[PDB]
Amino acid sequence: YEHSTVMPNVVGFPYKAHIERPGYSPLTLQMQVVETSLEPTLNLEYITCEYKTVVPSPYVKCCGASECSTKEKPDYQCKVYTGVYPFMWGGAYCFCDSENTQLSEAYVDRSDVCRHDHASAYKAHTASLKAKVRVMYGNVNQTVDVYVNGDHAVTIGGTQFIFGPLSSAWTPFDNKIVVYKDEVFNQDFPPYGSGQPGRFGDIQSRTVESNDLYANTALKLARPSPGMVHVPYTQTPSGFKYWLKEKGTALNTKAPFGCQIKTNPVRAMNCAVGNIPVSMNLPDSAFTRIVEAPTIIDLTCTVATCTHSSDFGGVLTLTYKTDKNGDCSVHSHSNVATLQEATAKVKTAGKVTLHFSTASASPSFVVSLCSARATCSASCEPPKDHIVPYAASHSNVVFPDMSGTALSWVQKISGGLGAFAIGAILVLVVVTCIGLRR
Amino acid sequence: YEHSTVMPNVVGFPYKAHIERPGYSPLTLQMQVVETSLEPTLNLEYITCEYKTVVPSPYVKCCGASECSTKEKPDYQCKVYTGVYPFMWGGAYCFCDSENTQLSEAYVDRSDVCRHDHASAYKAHTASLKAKVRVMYGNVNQTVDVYVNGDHAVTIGGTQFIFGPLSSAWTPFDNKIVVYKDEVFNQDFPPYGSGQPGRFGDIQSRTVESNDLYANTALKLARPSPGMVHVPYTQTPSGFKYWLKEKGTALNTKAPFGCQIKTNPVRAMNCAVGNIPVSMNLPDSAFTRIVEAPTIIDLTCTVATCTHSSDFGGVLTLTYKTDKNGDCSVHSHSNVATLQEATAKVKTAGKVTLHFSTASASPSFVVSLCSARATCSASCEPPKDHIVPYAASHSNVVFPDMSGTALSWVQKISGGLGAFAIGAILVLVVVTCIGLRR
Amino acid sequence: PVPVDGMEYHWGNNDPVRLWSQLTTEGKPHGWPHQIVQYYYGLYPAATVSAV
Amino acid sequence: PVPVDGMEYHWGNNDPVRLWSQLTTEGKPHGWPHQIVQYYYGLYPAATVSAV
């Protein structure tokens, strides 16, 4: 038997489904979304880590001239200085008075801890959801992992379930992403090969292991002081090290809809939005003979106490007459009220009790027990506690019923004015008919 | 100095760009897209391979009974038959004549070579384009490989190039793909966990090494024939094997725009669509000062022969007068004609020749040498060869110029008709003016 | 502020804590008409005036 | 058929080969007006008639 339904994507919300086979007693099955996950699809752009500067020892060559040679190294700087007259601990070497020369050389390279400590830059798109749902009905109770897209069917006790594509297509990750340890940042980084000194991306490499490297940090050499051997240089501080201090904010403390962020893999969890269609295919052993199910006649509903709080704060009593004892699959056909349980043991005493939660001062809903029906309405009073730590267990609908006190009152006033207008129109019509008949 | 232009995405088309700085003689750059590759992003859904059936030896419990035990194997089947009296070569054992039991057991499993012979079911989206391009100007050759999107800048001898995003977003891959060896198919595959026997996806596994499995082949065991030991079973043939011969067509021999598919990784190479915007940043070393550039005066253009064929089939003669001998940059400022060479060796004799390709009956275009300009117009006869084995080298512009023979005739006829109409209007106006002044 | 949707605060190294607000107010529903306006004023104090 | 875009064929076990058509016709361009129409009718014989 095929069936379909829709289910809100709110964690812990005990959604219920009611199925009515014409030859069989109705069934109520309970579904709940224990956990979700929103995997974005990533393609690495590059990696950034703090650089390291190597300076080889100066070549101070005496009594002659020397020439510099270019090399294929990331951000290489080499220069030749004349007239140098160095000194050492014992004395001054380079016997020639002023025909000396110094070769200063310097270049940059990725630091040795870069494999352990670095920040990645991704482009994120096309999120895919996945979830785990607990289902239960009759004597079956299971927790299953399902992809929330229209092509993963999972079997639970002979029943086939398919969870359709999500209602909306909202994702928290921007087009460009920067990941560091266990935090994700909605940022935009400079293009590879065009980094700038002093900011994020002063050095860039396509992958942690890639041999090439593009570094641009303005390494500038200056001539050494008279009588010293020290190779002085000026070179802008680390861009990655600046960014680690001035990144600002995060996503873990800024994402909407109150959904956590986690890394490895990048994912956003428990992120409540939208509706999930469900398609179901059930066997014929799940239901029961209507003959074997008890029959219910003269069904009446009375509400004892109502209080629209977040917890299950209203109590119903159903009175009836039965022929044989058994189990009934109770359900409420409206979302104004949400019931607690899905089965009741019907006994010859003809008195059963149920708990529910609502959010309107005057709710009115039709509740069904096995095959019977009843229409039940209640009056509810506000709750006192201002703040509580558990989520709402009702569907959050507030519009009152037409039979409620406020709407009955407005009905009476509108009826008075309407009858007044009708009387006025009748008087005018009679008078004008007499005038025309004259 | 910055600059921007657009170039067609055709492999082997010799694009020539003109740079005209106010304080220097012009440059001409040349570009050729020697190769492209359009790689989609893939998500593995499942892997299919031919199944294999395990049939354990039967258990014959004689002078007793046995009961069926259930297990958890894919498509597991187990049954018990009663009344068997099996025979062996030495004779008939199981002395008990009638009350015997035979237990039949079977299930399915992935093949031994599923690791080397399998078909992958992918889902593809959000393609990324990669290019390899030859750039040449002044005196530098070189080919670089660039990601074609606004975020990869490559430096080619002191010049920076950025290839912006592609104009059109057409990708030959549909939303679902099946990859087998070296062929790609645009196929809709069944959802995971709902494969039907006898077609593609009769057995389904999440990844080649994952231990779980989902199988539908509908094994049915049968009562063994009297006096024998065989465990007879029946099963629908292999879905993957059937798909192998009934797959039909491919994409390799079907893709539009004439680009060839390759696998590992899956990509589509060398197909023409749209334009690549390219942005440049050149240093001052590339240009030449106008005082060094020779000055060209009184430049005029003539055509010797013109045949609008795919190859370079028109010979152009430029005559001029100069003061010193040197080199100039030659360009044609219209896409109705394309020049073969970008630099010319200018002498004092006052004659140069160039080669151009066109596709219009009466081309008209403005050609420039160093700082001068002139206009060329010609008459081109169609070629004689019906078929050529090389791609066209013109921009494929057909509409003739307005001064050509055809539009000359149109202009003459329209001028005659307009003269007649204006004369009639003047006569009528004069007559009506006389009538009004009467 | 803790609107009806709720909010989480994360203090030091403790786990973040989430708090939700209930639909409470100060009027009297199911009473006199001038008290019902108070009750539906406490909730949504921006469309009640317009509707009245 | 081999239009002005071109086609490739794959015969047996060789490598595929490409062929491109070329702008050829049977009229005489740059002659009389009753011949230029033939020249431009050999090419694109669906808009020339409409234009004339």
Ligand SMILES: *[C@@H]1O[C@H](CO)[C@@H](O[C@@H]2O[C@H](CO)[C@@H](O[C@@H]3O[C@H](CO)[C@@H](O)[C@H](O)[C@@H]3O)[C@H](O)[C@H]2NC(C)=O)[C@H](O)[C@H]1NC(C)=O
């Ligand atoms: C021991 O000390 C003496 C110092 O006199 C060193 O003699 C030096 O030898 C070099 C050889 O290349 C001379 O350099 C040349 O000088 C000429 C003149 O300027 C110049 O044109 C060449 O291009 C080259 O630079 C240097 O002048 C000379 N010193 C003098 C003459 O005072 C000698 O090399 C030392 N022995 C060693 C280091 O083994």
Ligand SMILES: *[C@@H]1O[C@H](CO)[C@@H](O[C@@H]2O[C@H](CO)[C@@H](O[C@@H]3O[C@H](CO)[C@@H](O)[C@H](O)[C@@H]3O)[C@H](O)[C@H]2NC(C)=O)[C@H](O)[C@H]1NC(C)=O
């Ligand atoms: C359907 O089956 C699931 C599990 O298969 C049942 O989950 C059960 O949930 C209860 C409470 O939600 C767990 O009891 C808890 O035990 C801990 C032990 O320290 C205790 O601290 C808690 O206060 C609570 O008593 C129970 O272990 C868990 N069953 C498991 C894990 O097997 C679920 O209750 C079933 N549905 C129904 C309607 O019973």
Ligand SMILES: *[C@@H]1O[C@H](CO)[C@@H](O[C@@H]2O[C@H](CO)[C@@H](O[C@@H]3O[C@H](CO)[C@@H](O)[C@H](O)[C@@H]3O)[C@H](O)[C@H]2NC(C)=O)[C@H](O)[C@H]1NC(C)=O
């Ligand atoms: C050696 O051969 C003798 C030949 O009879 C086997 O005796 C047979 O044993 C089986 C198993 O105990 C008996 O089956 C029983 O039948 C009764 C109904 O009569 C039923 O109530 C029991 O539940 C059981 O199924 C069978 O009757 C008996 N043969 C005769 C003639 O009574 C003996 O088992 C063989 N031993 C070995 C080790 O093979």
Ligand SMILES: *[C@@H]1O[C@H](CO)[C@@H](O[C@@H]2O[C@H](CO)[C@@H](O[C@@H]3O[C@H](CO)[C@@H](O)[C@H](O)[C@@H]3O)[C@H](O)[C@H]2NC(C)=O)[C@H](O)[C@H]1NC(C)=O
């Ligand atoms: C820039 O570099 C490329 C590649 O280094 C140059 O293309 C090369 O040009 C030479 C001759 O111009 C080619 O050699 C000849 O090629 C023909 C092709 O049919 C072959 O049959 C001959 O036996 C001979 O090998 C060479 O193959 C060609 N290379 C490539 C990859 O096309 C290009 O000429 C350089 N730029 C300039 C302005 O020359």
